[PDB]
Design a protein around this ligand. Structure first.
Ligand SMILES: CC(C)(COP(=O)(O)OP(=O)(O)OC[C@H]1O[C@@H](n2cnc3c(N)ncnc32)[C@H](O)[C@@H]1OP(=O)(O)O)[C@@H](O)C(=O)NCCC(=O)NCCSC(=O)CCC(=O)O
Ligand SMILES: CC(C)(COP(=O)(O)OP(=O)(O)OC[C@H]1O[C@@H](n2cnc3c(N)ncnc32)[C@H](O)[C@@H]1OP(=O)(O)O)[C@@H](O)C(=O)NCCC(=O)NCCSC(=O)CCC(=O)O
Ligand SMILES: CC(C)(COP(=O)(O)OP(=O)(O)OC[C@H]1O[C@@H](n2cnc3c(N)ncnc32)[C@H](O)[C@@H]1OP(=O)(O)O)[C@@H](O)C(=O)NCCC(=O)NCCSC(=O)CCC(=O)O
Ligand SMILES: [Mg+2]
Ligand SMILES: [Mg+2]
Ligand SMILES: [Mg+2]
Ligand SMILES: [Mg+2]
Ligand SMILES: [Mg+2]
Ligand code: NA
Ligand code: NA
Lengths: 307, 297, 304
């Protein structure tokens, strides 16, 4: 019942040996085993990667072929190669969010200056910049521990209008469209076809047929329940500029412009109120703010009733 | 009706599908017959002649064509035609709704847009490994619509982050799109506007009207395409699900959906949809009573 | 009175307009005399000498200059001076409002920022066709302010999407700007902050304060600049049109405008502006009554 994983990768190391990134063209799941990354011998390097190995004197970096193995996906990432493999498994949809331990990545990953000449270390970057500029403009896409998903894999059946907004480790199921205002973090994303125009925080999962409206916030700052991760089930709709700090079951809706936090008091059809966290995971709910009273209300959506 | 025509440089995928077409100089014409033809050698402009070739790593080819649209009222027949329509809008030769922009999702190819040019989704991972021999491979987006500025930069405009303006967006002189603004195709401004929020496809904003940061026009669950008239202001993080006339204001943080019940000065309420298109209105949520209300300006 | 100086690599348009200047190592100096001069050959640093030249396709030239600002309290006189000011802020040599950042819009050239370097608006469509001989032509933006990280990467910082930080933003160590974060010029953080919403020009956020996803901070109090003190939290999709002192919270989804009438624990109401700069406040919209309320935090009671 323990599953492992393995992949041949092209890793870029900084001048001090720090792992900046690793691209695995064909990761795969394997029987449980022993975690380690090794340098591949010449005869084991796929021909497509052999042409990509080298040293960049201006960036002071080297690109090397490795094989990374994870003994158990339940274990925490040991090092950055292991971290990059786990992120690739998610974005390749070989594992769904929470199907592997995605804990502790901030601590294991290197902060990288991502440029139009490849990953660079922070250390010595201003001298690197001046050297690279002999080649043409130096553009820095971002400075962060997580790069852009699409620079490692483009999953099929998917559209991403502005790929700055999908981190490697995001899981986008076939039929998903991420629009310009959409954002998907690592260990997060969609299980089926969703229009994603709002923000899916790390660990958040959105079920098949559910749409996230423009500017909508799922599990944002001050949204509530610190501890447990929230998810939304199937056929849910979050209105534009809405927010959500509790899980939703199937067939729920949050009105445009409404932020439902776990601690928000919600008035029910019977006139009683509960904290929204008491509704977390329920189905068939519509949340709105009454435009006459200003009260946050929840209504049943199927003609049946809340519970 | 009016037709259009233009000479374009198209990129075809390995299977012949049209990935994109750049038309440096589209123009309007008398009505005629829709068709795209490959240009003969003597008809290729000299600026474009150096750009034609085949890319063996991407498995694509770039070719010079002339696309004619017989009538701007017809639906786009093919991707060349679709690209020509989007160029007419961004060139401001045609205003939103000034041509038929329906059916494009169905006509346009889903494209992997890269720092090496457009690529097909099919065989992309093998293409990526081959291109990496040239340097890093960066994918800007995977979608049916590219970035307007990569085809035309219209005059009198600023766009702080050009990832946020689709080809097909119409931005009148004096318009500034800030980093949080977004303008879809067949949509945009007719005059000078500060755009820091989201203009959905089909939506037009009149001269002098400003869209505050994070504002949503016609977003999901907001409520016939809507439009904003002249000298309006949508507050930051606000939303609009109805049309506004001239001189309207929506308070920061308020979402006026078509189904929102609004209290008028006399204490009577109405659904906001009944006010659609009115001028001189201020919408706010009263911070004391909690009620969405409208005031005269 | 403090001045500043820097050797820079300037790119000029075909008509001589300054498109940008990159200053690798700006420095503060004694009060002095403002001027930009072309460096003689012997004064060009070896790393910049290799970068000087003329681009015939773009119709631009890159030149080595030294720019001196006589007094940081004076308004920028021209684009070289403006770019130096912006670099002083982003290098954290000056904090926001530590130099006069007025009139920059009027001084700076509107630039087509491309993967081939800065280009002029003038004649750009022909330039694009020539540059496509080299490969794809990607336009990042068309604006007077370029992306900070293309001039300096400050240490101790993360920026998930660097399209969203203008040159002139001041990001103190421990700062993370996430994809939804935005930081304008003459604005930013004084210490460690998680920034996932929008910091307008002139706006400063104190050590340990976090700006939630999609939150909106207005630049001024509808003419006093808005700031946030230490340990404040703005919830996702919230908005702030008044200053906050320390240890304040604005609830997710609530926009506090200067004119909003807020009800207080004693049930009297004030305009929110009357609370501007106070500490220990929590603003929320009551989910039963619809009213915007302010609560005292941590038994601290409330000061106007
Ligand atoms: O007390 P009142 O009955 O005057 O107020 P109320 O019944 O709560 O609201 C009046 C009507 O407006 C509706 N209403 C309230 N807030 C709304 C919102 N955000 N979107 C759409 N409809 C809304 C109520 O369902 C009700 O419909 P009905 O009157 O149609 O039930
Ligand atoms: C609703 C308005 C438009 C009101 O404008 P005014 O100029 O009247 O402001 P004012 O003088 O403060 O308000 C007039 C009177 O109404 C009262 N008042 C105001 N709002 C109220 C409310 N919701 N309920 C009850 N009373 C209210 C005030 O106390 C004052 O009372 P007295 O009668 O007693 O005097 C404003 O508060 C607003 O929302 N503006 C938003 C601006 C905005 O977002 N601009 C977009 C660019 S900014 C941006 O994009 C942000 C950065 C970013 O997001 O990136
Ligand atoms: O309302 P109170 O008078 O209880 O205020 P408080 O106790 O100081 O604030 C904490 C309580 O307010 C609730 N609460 C949170 N957000 C709210 C909102 N927007 N409107 C009304 N109540 C709200 C929390 O669930 C919490 O419940 P408890 O008071 O039940 O913890
Ligand atoms: Mg069910
Ligand atoms: Mg970008
Ligand atoms: Mg946004
Ligand atoms: Mg610190
Ligand atoms: Mg204090
Ligand atoms: Na399905
Ligand atoms: Na971007």
């Amino acid at each position: 019942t323990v599953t492992g994983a393995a992949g041949i990768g092209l890793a870029t190391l900084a001048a001090d040996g720090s792992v900046l990134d690793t691209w695995f063209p064909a990761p795969e799941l394997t029987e449980s085993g022993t975690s380690a990354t090794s340098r591949l011998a010449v005869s084991d390097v796929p021909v497509e990667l052999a042409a990509l190995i080298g040293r960049d004197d201006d960036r002071r970096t080297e690109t090397i072929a490795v094989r990374t193995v994870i003994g158990s996906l339940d274990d925490v990432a040991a090092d950055p190669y292991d971290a990059y493999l786990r992120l690739h498994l998610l974005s390749h949809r070989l594992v769904a969010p929470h199907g592997l331990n995605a804990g502790g990545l901030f601590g294991v990953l290197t902060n990288v200056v991502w440029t139009n000449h490849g990953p660079c270390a922070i250390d010595g970057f201003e001298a690197v910049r001046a050297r690279l500029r002999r080649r043409g403009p130096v553009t820095v896409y971002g400075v962060d521990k997580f790069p852009r998903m699409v620079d490692y894999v483009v999953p099929t059946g998917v559209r991403i209008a502005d790929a700055d907004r999908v981190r490697l480790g995001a899981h986008l199921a076939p039929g998903t469209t991420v629009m310009h205002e959409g954002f998907v973090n690592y260990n997060a994303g969609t299980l089926g076809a969703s229009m994603v125009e709002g923000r899916i925080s790390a660990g958040v999962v959105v079920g098949d047929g559910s749409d996230v409206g423009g500017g909508a916030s799922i599990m944002g700052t001050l949204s509530g329940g610190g501890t447990h991760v929230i998810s939304i089930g199937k056929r849910c709709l979050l209105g534009a500029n809405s927010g959500l700090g509790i899980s939703l079951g199937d067939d729920c809706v949050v009105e445009a412009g409404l932020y439902v936090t776990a601690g928000t008091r919600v008035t029910m059809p019977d006139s009683n109120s509960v904290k929204a966290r008491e509704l977390s995971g329920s189905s068939n709910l519509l949340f709105r703010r009454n435009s006459v009273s200003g009260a946050v209300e929840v209504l049943a959506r199927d003609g049946q009733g809340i519970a």
